[model samples]
Target: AEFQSFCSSASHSGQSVKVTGNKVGTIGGVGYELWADSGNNSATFYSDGSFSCTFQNAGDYLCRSGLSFDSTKTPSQIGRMKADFKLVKQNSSNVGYSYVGVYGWTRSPLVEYYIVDNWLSPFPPGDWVGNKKHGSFTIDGAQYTVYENTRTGPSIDGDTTFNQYFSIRQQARDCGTIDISAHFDQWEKLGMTMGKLHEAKVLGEAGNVNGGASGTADFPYAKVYIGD
Candidate 1:
């Protein structure tokens, strides 16, 4: 009910698709993807780079919706990675884990990373139990907690062991600019090296292991770029 009018609106002039499962497509000249592990999860993407998603009756599963980029260039080679976004709505009840910001992976060393600025759960990513805290730093006027955790499971390179890096914001905000490269630099200083850029995008991810987490969120304005 929240995002019924977006696709039909005059300002929206891009592909409109309601996704039931894992899907990827190009919208407005950029690659976009929506992945929902269970049938209970769904997402709708409009051509104007806007999306709304829902998650229901899921645990230990992940559902995400956002813009995807394929780049062989590293962050340093691509210059500063930035994302300007406005998270219009993110509401959840009994959410276990959630993240709203930049999420991506690297191939050379096989790493999953997050630069979370907003969340809807009690313990944000990297703050969860068993995640080792590496340090903290300030970026885009906010203090972020850095962490590195080894995850042994499915990855971009398939099932394997790889490190997960997080730069979670201390205070959650719904809209702003995220200087993604800044976090990468900070992580490297902490001895958490990165690999060649595989894919990076602005994303919304949520799920839990014990279930009972459900919600809907919409990003009306989200853009990812490499320069300036």
Candidate 2:
């Protein structure tokens, strides 16, 4: 398959980069980053706003390398927040759980959110413990299920309480434009409120809590915008 071939070549390329532990820094200009957490991971941020991430040795890992908003303005206030991404490669082995899409945080209301477009995790994550299904909505020609879960622990604001919103696509795809604001509006309709923007980015998160899992994802073309 195309993804397998791309993953093989890219993983062996000299352009690939590996970091120690918990890495974060801007690359390919401002507003973008080479971000990853937990341990045993590698990422490469290209000069063209593209990136790739590979994860092994589980126990919680997240690599979100894309746009980092200025930490101001709500999604509505920012106009139409959107992400155009082409996932040239995506593969996983011994996956305990994983998802690829847009991930971010919000303040005031203190919310974490995911607009998942592809996944190797259990379907309808709302079925997971502590999460509730709010329903589903269609946007940008696809249907997405809405969910909310309360997480009580450390977050962007230290130890505290926060809500987590999820808009998971019913069908998985490797490339497309995500109308991020549309998901926000759907969450609002379901009483899943959010606050000021923290950071929104393309995410390829894979890992496990009790065991080990491995995965690789590459975004050959990605762009984020606030409006038309």
Each prediction's RMSD over C-alphas, in Å, is: 5.0, 4.6
Candidate 1, residues 104-196, lDDT tens digits: the string is 888777888888888767666655632689766786667988888889876777679988889889887676678888899898888888888
* Clash number for candidate 1: 1
**Model 1, global lDDT:** 0.71
Q: What TM-score goes with each of the models?
A: 0.85, 0.83
CA lDDT of each prediction against the hidden true structure: 0.71, 0.70
The top-ranked prediction according to TM-score is 1
Question: What is candidate 2's lDDT per residue for 1-228, written digit by digit as tens?
Answer: 324333333322223344445666665452443333354767776545567777776655676655666557787886778877767556677666666788889987899899888865544243672379877678667988777999886576878899999888888877777888888888888887778888888777776666676777777766666775
Error of 1 at 77 (Å): 1.7
TM-score quality measure for candidate 2: 0.83
